[PDB]
């Protein structure tokens, strides 16, 4: 009912620096005398955690580095300095009237030194062959930034059918990303070809990291 | 110690109502408001309605009025929400929150409801040992493949939870009405295979607790 918009939608801030988050309102929530604007921190898989209520007053247990301000419709939350465990989507909510509404979302991400992924290729297990399946797994662990492309090659030729990808959220300590790719194939298709290469291009190096295995062993 | 304990995950067919419980402990149940919040996967937060455990007093969001009903039992100190005839746009994470005017102080874990009209399928656990060949050295990675299951979630554990520091758990991605999820653990070469590293996989719907030891191929 009362629209709350957050700017920007996503911000990148280096460790130890200042981050500014805005929350615009369609109606003045500060009515009657005091501001009824709350702030929340939500890490993936976890419920939102209340940081600051009424724009100014912080909740007990929350560090003083989390600071909020504003009145009427324009409200701002700042974190100074930022830490590795600040990776979360931050929300502003309003009380006042009439059905309670949350903000819009603003994802916080940390900029650090560029890291190269440690690539590890895994052949299908012996129990996969008995079931009739064949999944070749490839893990890309601890790298920055998030932008990465994985290309599967079977016997020198690229394969894009049956590729399953999943990206992790930023680490609460390392502030790094991780990705896993799997070739969902059948036993009939697996035994016909020999070489399987996992290839990944990144900003850290022009040469792609190629990890491969042969079925012949 | 104020706590809110919500129920487990839920799989429902379209056109079936469901009750979601929220157990409260550590405070006087009848003296505080309890708000309920909906979260569409990969989206923002939605306020559903509040309930006062003292007596029958509720106010709902106009978008949820004819769908959500709130009840509270004083003797068991549990807040319960019923959601009538669930659709595709109802598959979300529902939260219960304790509110002391006018901010949500304490939260539950959140119940993940999925609809979803597919059959519940058993997960298949596959151990991922390093590429064939008697070791490589330095620091080797181990993996665990969970292929073809329904529905969410799957709780992944390594050695009952002792070696849970260098673990990368990947979010599940749906393919052809089936979920797939992987986990990788990176350990030093000195502690493998001298120390036995096991993969603990648990699934609620199929009621399966498959434990698999990763042994060199």
Residue numbers in the entry:
A (entry chain A): 1 to 217
B (entry chain B): 501 to 717
What does the original paper state about this entry?
Most neutralizing antibodies bind to E2, as this glycoprotein is more exposed on the viral surface than E1.
All Fab fragments bound the VLPs with one Fab fragment per E2 molecule. These Fab structures were fitted into the cryoEM maps of the corresponding VLP-Fab complexes. The coordinates of the E2 B domain in the VLPs did not agree well with the B domain density in the maps of the VLP complexed with the CHK-9 or m242 Fab fragments, suggesting that the E2 B domain had a different orientation in these Fab-bound structures than in the non-complexed VLPs. The height of the density for the variable domains of the Fab fragments was comparable to that of the CHIKV glycoprotein, suggesting a nearly 100% binding occupancy of the Fab fragments under saturating binding conditions. Such a stoichiometry would require substantially higher concentrations of Fabs to inhibit infectivity, as seen with CHK-9, m10 and m242 Fabs. In summary our structural studies suggest that the CHK-9, m10, and m242 Fab fragments neutralize CHIKV infectivity by blocking the cellular binding site on the A domain of E2 and that the CHK152 inhibits fusion by stabilizing domain B of E2, preventing exposure of the fusion loop on E1.
